[PDB]
Symmetry: D2
Subunit: 430 residues, 4 copies
């Protein structure tokens, strides 16, 4: 039918491959998955349509799914998140990948539709990040719905949307919540953003974090990671939250907690980690100090009112890709990053490989569960068993040279748990 | 029958009362419980037998239960944890309290038995910390078992024991797991020990934390708090763990993770936050650097092998209460704290009031739930609803001057949650 | 003439001795000074009159000076700073020590005067902390001025006063600035207070630091240490400064920097590390939140206006020694600590031994320099040579197990410095 | 004579100018210098030959010197440190700048020689960073030596070389040590590297810092900044030092301190902040874990033995500019960054603007002192007066919204210092 793939420049493949080479050495989980299942090919017969930012780490994921006997067609879930040299390597590798940095809402949709049909039939598996693929099939291609063995969501918002779908009886295929595995959530969301947020901010503005007032909206795992990152550089972080528990945590950590209505007049850097709309409005923009850097890191771009900036600023000047400086009627400048989209993936290279290995290992595990043990997952959204969760963490201990302790028969008996058996109750929050 | 109470010295009452006065101003949760239920007296008709360290904060708890119409008889759950001036105030207040610092395993048991019978009948409610009261009634006073409306456990180990009791069909009265409320666990266990661990170590040895190698066993909430406390002072913290996930977290936080077999040769300060036996054995003691300070903060005193010290040391010299310096055949000295018992409560005054207010508020809520809505809790161990969990955090926001944000109808709609309604799924780990 | 000594209770000697025993094992610098000079007795013929807080560490110092052949008579430089068991050990050891906790401005002066005359003549050496002894001799006993070989000051304020005395031609004996050795200043003032500030606050109030607003006046070495200590527990530290450089440093570290006029309305804990008067006035007290804990850690008690509290509070109630709760007309309570005096030494046991070893080693070195090489120090205030400064740090490396690197002849040549020779220019600030 | 300038591409001017625009708003010190001296033109008649990395911040510096009436000709002091868009803006602005990224040791020297001669005569002023310009004139163009009014050095090594030159009677023109101003040293070297080190490492490798063992050579201001940056992301930092004082500081901060001989077997990331040769040798390389990232941040590229890598590695593969992966006979890979040159400036954009404003303001002040008050600086190397040092910090307080406190006449009197007058003795180390 359509082309075999389409990227920005396939001349980037060589370089993309070196990156993939270094990347692999940083993601033990994925490589271990390869080590164990390359022969068995547990994913044989699977036609996985994936919609997840096309980065170097997503490239190692794709190739791991393939090494396991799967058949995939990829696409990014963000028009800015793609890493073109990574996409090139994948494309040149024979994998039909349809993504490139800077697509248009139009081309974006074209790419997703490109992954729906395989050589010997339509997709029978979904690996989503954001729920775009699953929402597309569900609302536009209902016919394919019954041929999909399972879904694999990894984003807080997406998984949130899934639970909602079920709550309304809209979900029609078994889904697995991968975001809520301890190794994914407590490490990706938190440790990931702690490292990739300032990377985006810096590569984009090269601003000095130290001595600045950074306002972080939301103290969830992402906000926790961002608040920590900024704090460590010498910034005075102010937090805004709607949850009294998350609010108390910020307070116990020495962060002042106020409303954006108040904080906007103080902040020097604004970071939205909220999962919802209307976090930074024009009423706030009008208060901001000159040259205030505004950016969003929550999965979607609905948190900052960019339209307002565009329709109220005296003038807008692009400094470079994904970096705009608006001049407001008050004579104050505002530096918007990545047009209100994910700053780490849009102005930088996303989370580091090591941490992505945790999430993606969880991803590969979900793909094998749903595909290999279907009758184990009725229509609804499930979690990965704790044993697999701990296995995922275990796989990365070696690289870090961590030496785990082994319970003695006596201890295991005293604690009333197995030497290896899950070490924590299902309600444990780590 | 027996005496009305028994403490170390009732002459301490005056001072204990001033402490309670200042304490109250630090525990908004308890005071708010008083504010709302003093009139209704939801605990009227309840005869609560409590077994929880008798400290200033436990004093404010006792008086809060009483202000709610309850009838109580207290006792500490530790022979060293009691704060005598606090006990005096309670005793002098007409509350039959039977506890004092430095009891003997014999007197310890006598005190618990003293709380079992009230003026108009035996205890019909349990407020335990460690499971000693609930295990006593269950195995020694089974007759009273059917008159108890419910249990209230707050310790990780105790709640662990409860879940075990049910698993074996031994639990005969509905129990509520208070330790696992987010406001209890993530704040008491973690933030509490972060503050009270060094307090105990310092008051006992006055040692300098900076530049020392502190070895922390277990990276759970307690270990997390201790590791952070020690790190913040300039100590090099090494962690030991059996859980791969908790191990990875330590690693992601920059803590070296090894086995005690290896760390014992390096440590300058040892802290066991494990919930199990045989953490520090003689084989380790023999390796320790001269004057190594050893102490335990995990609920029980089974983690450090003190017997070994006692039966192998060339000689033992007490420096002062709860501080002993053993001389080993190798010519190395070892400073044991609180005889291997909880260091923060035995060498210091336990956790600060503000944080105890969180747990105790949870405690008061469980007492009212079990007492007031019995048919809501069949025999087994339950959790407090999230709504109550968030209410507990909310109650402490004011004192800290935190300004919570309120979702707009639009946002509440977008997120698909209530403006007030619980803001997180039951699986949320914060 | 007068008594041989006078302390609070000589029955404390035994216990004081065990503390001294443990202390010695923590002060390698002093012990090494003992190791090398016990035989030579470089201080033989010296009659050192000392005025320095009489604590366990000052006890090890005293005994070290004696092991070096010196003759001493001690006294504390604070009426609250004395550690009675430590004084008892020294007194019982035959050393005429005249100090005890809780003296009166009257007894304080009597004690200092007690150290001026020795068996075979008046004092011929001064070891001061605060300048009280040197100012006493200079203004009250000028006759003894010409028999004193040298002065040894260790406090920022005292050394400040010395430089002033010289600037006005009032100093009549060679003094050595010991505070300004790198090993004293950057370690004692900073790391010391980082550890002993919260100790004092906690032992006194047992308040929870986390989630509180702590206001620190002055960002010098002491303020730096305090700000860091409070920050590490979860407090939101606000800083006040008069120096633009020290102010910028605070900002670069993420601390908001405002005026006390503004901060008083926000603070929950106030710490004055300033070296001057009128830091916290009544105008501030009237603004403070209820139960605000106020304390001072700067050498003198002139920073907090305690008189005002005493003359304007509706009522004052002592909670226990060195802890008072004033009720203000506005209905707000204010918890004053140590009556506005050094909180770490007055409500706790001062700085830990390890760090005091650094200062005291510097102290012993100055005593030997001034005594042994007099013609090397004309009347004026001098510094210890860098070689001795590095020697002091070196002496503590072993205990911490630090492995120092040794320049190769090639490297030493490239850098143009000696393998051992001082490694930094005199202007180096570390 | 020669061309008017030479850069990589003048088409970059537009973009470089937008960067300069944003940069200006981040460097208050330079802008304030402009505000005050633009009219007076204190640098009129000056022909400043500058040799300092040609970055956006150096661009704002150049334009500030020009706004003050100076005449300049620039060149970078590093063949990789140049920021081409910044150079283009300067070149297109009419300023003869001769620098571009990726020059050859040959072109490097050509550029410096290009700045020596101006329209109306040779250079009469030097603004150096590294001592290359001053060492060139001194050893190659001695004739011009007597026409230069003064030197301005800002690098630790350069200033080190200057002191050496004087010590040997080689220095023939008054020099000013700008690196050793408190506002330069404690902020640039320390806070600068804290922010720009990981930027270079990340942009180059995109490696995850968390959970890695980072080995930092040298604990001076740079090492302090690097150690702190790495620590804050979750890395376990090990320190190596030759100075016992700097070593004790690292220890007191919780960093293990060992020899490179030992640490090389453990490190995952190596950073040399030393100011000398032979820090990382082949004997170390042969021990490093696979894919160990090695980089240098100390001013020169003599710290890592790159020649060895080049002459002993089985094979070398370039991943991209300034990023090479060597394969060692042992089968271990080694990732070298920026060919052993400054990693922050070579793989990233150097220090942020705000902090560079501090150094550069000091630089402008030195240019005016040497030029304007010549007879104030005889041949030798001097420091800027404290008043100017504090002025520099003061100038950046506003942007950060810091509210400095003002001593009262009473306080100023008590402290014995002026309300504005320098607030610290010359030996103060901050
Ligand atoms: N760009 C990335 O690399 C990346 C990585 C992980 C997650 N995410 C996205 O970031 C978002 C946050 O994820 P998370 O795991 O931290 O979610 P989370 O649920 O843990 O936390 C979000 C927090 O926002 C708070 N909040 C909600 N509305 C708010 C408002 N109006 N004002 C202030 N606070 C508010 C909530 O109380 C909650 O604690 C999600 O959309 C997720 O998909 C992005
Ligand atoms: N003294 C106090 O103030 C106080 C306050 C709260 C809890 N506690 C007690 O401390 C203990 C720990 O509580 P928690 O909430 O942190 O529990 P937790 O379950 O969160 O963590 C305990 C950790 O220990 C690790 N562990 C178990 N056996 C180990 C071993 N042999 N070696 C190394 N690590 C091992 C586990 O993997 C786990 O992560 C409990 O007994 C609890 O009752 C004391
Ligand atoms: N109790 C102890 O254990 C202990 C230990 C060391 C020093 N000290 C004492 O603490 C004091 C401070 O010592 P240091 O070494 O940190 O001194 P320092 O000179 O380094 O710092 C004091 C700081 O106070 C700032 N300051 C001055 N007046 C101020 C005002 N009105 N408002 C705000 N800030 C102001 C100054 O700019 C300076 O940076 C001295 O009196 C010293 O003797 C006490
Ligand atoms: N790239 C940049 O942005 C940047 C910024 C400032 C300074 N620098 C450069 O970095 C270097 C360090 O500057 P600094 O201000 O921190 O110098 P510094 O003098 O403060 O510290 C260097 C430290 O190295 C230690 N050291 C010396 N030889 C050693 C060895 N063989 N092993 C271990 N430690 C050793 C010294 O004891 C000293 O403490 C200088 O060359 C300087 O020009 C670079
Ligand atoms: N390097 C990377 N590759 C792929 C995806 C990446 C990424 N960095 C961040 N995300 C975003 C996700 O981590 C986020 O949406 C999630 O929820 O896991
Ligand atoms: N001040 C205090 N009063 C009462 C109890 C106190 C305490 N500090 C610590 N615990 C121990 C509990 O926090 C612990 O066993 C728990 O699990 O909550
Ligand atoms: N344990 C202790 N012994 C003696 C003195 C002690 C002390 N702690 C603090 N100071 C105060 C000094 O550190 C301080 O005034 C100084 O300037 O050195
Ligand atoms: N953005 C930048 N512009 C110019 C120079 C820069 C720089 N970043 C670091 N250096 C290096 C200097 O900070 C260093 O060599 C010094 O000693 O000041």
């Amino acid at each position: 039918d359509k082309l075999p793939y389409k990227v920005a420049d396939i001349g980037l493949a060589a370089w993309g491959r070196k990156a993939l080479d270094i990347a692999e050495n940083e993601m033990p989980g994925l490589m271990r998955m390869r080590e164990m299942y390359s022969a068995s090919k547990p994913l044989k017969g699977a036609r996985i349509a994936g919609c997840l930012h096309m980065t170097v780490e997503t490239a190692v994921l794709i190739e791991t799914l393939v090494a396991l006997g799967a058949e995939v067609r990829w696409s990014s879930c963000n028009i800015f998140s793609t890493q073109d040299h990574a996409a090139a390597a994948i494309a040149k590798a024979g994998i039909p990948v349809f993504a490139w940095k800077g697509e248009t809402d139009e081309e974006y949709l074209w790419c997703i539709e490109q992954t729906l049909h395989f050589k010997d039939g339509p997709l029978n598996m979904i690996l989503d990040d954001g729920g775009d693929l699953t929402n597309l099939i569900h609302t536009k291609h209902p016919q394919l719905l019954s041929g999909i063995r399972g879904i694999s969501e990894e984003t807080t918002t997406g998984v949130h949307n899934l639970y909602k779908m079920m709550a309304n009886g809209i979900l029609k295929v078994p889904a697995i919540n991968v975001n809520d595995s301890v190794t994914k959530s407590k490490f990706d969301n938190l440790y990931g953003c702690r490292e990739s947020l300032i990377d985006g901010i810096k590569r984009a503005t090269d601003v000095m974090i130290a001595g600045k007032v950074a306002v972080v909206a939301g103290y969830g795992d992402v906000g926790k990671g961002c608040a920590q990152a900024l704090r460590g550089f010498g910034a005075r972080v102010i937090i805004t939250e709607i949850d009294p528990i998350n609010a108390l945590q910020a307070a116990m950590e020495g962060y002042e907690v106020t409303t954006m209505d108040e904080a906007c007049k103080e902040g020097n850097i604004f970071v939205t980690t909220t999962g919802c709309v209307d976090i930074i409005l024009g009423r706030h923009f009008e208060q901001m100090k000159d040259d205030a850097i505004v950016c969003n890191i929550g999965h979607f771009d609905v948190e900052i009112d960019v339209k307002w900036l565009n329709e109220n600023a005296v003038e807008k000047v692009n400094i470079k890709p994904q970096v705009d400086r608006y001049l407001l009627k008050n004579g104050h400048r505002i530096i918007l990053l990545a047009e209100g989209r994910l700053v780490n993936l849009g102005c930088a290279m996303g989370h580091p490989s090591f941490v992505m290995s945790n999430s993606f290992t969880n991803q590969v595990m979900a793909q094998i569960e749903l595909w290999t043990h279907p009758d184990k997952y009725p229509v609804g959204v499930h979690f990965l068993p704790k044993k697999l969760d701990e296995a995922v963490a275990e796989a990365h201990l070696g690289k870090l040279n961590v030496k785990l302790t082994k319970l003695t028969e006596k201890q295991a008996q005293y604690l009333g748990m197995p030497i290896n058996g899950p070490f924590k109750p299902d309600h444990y929050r780590y």
